[PDB]
């Protein structure tokens, strides 16, 4: 969906450095201050909150 975005190609070419396999990897990475933002569906992160 971000690849179809013609003006957000910077995000598509930047997230390839930080693409993660599972969401628990992303939770542990943002928990250990390795991440600073994470685009994701809402209710999953609400339950994780």
């Amino acid at each position: 969906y971000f690849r179809r975005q013609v003006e957000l190609s910077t995000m598509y070419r930047h997230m390839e450095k930080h693409n993660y396999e599972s969401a628990a990897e992303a939770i542990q990475a943002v928990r250990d201050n390795k991440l600073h933002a994470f685009i994701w569906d809402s209710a999953v992160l609400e339950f994780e909150a």
């Binding site: 969906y1 992303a26 939770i27 943002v30 928990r31 201050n33 991440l35 600073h36 933002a37 994470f38 685009i39 994701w40 569906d41 809402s42 209710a43 999953v44 992160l45 994780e48």
Partner: protein, 50 residues
Amino acid sequence: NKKEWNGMMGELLSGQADMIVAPLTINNERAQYIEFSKPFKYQGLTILVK
């Protein structure tokens, strides 16, 4: 030199599965090839911070 599918969709196209029961993201690209039922969950996108 071909774009092909992987994951649950790639194993469903190979016939290794019968019905994806999962939080499956609905979009244009998947609907071109497989079929969707009526959705159970409705949500958008958000940013996780600390």
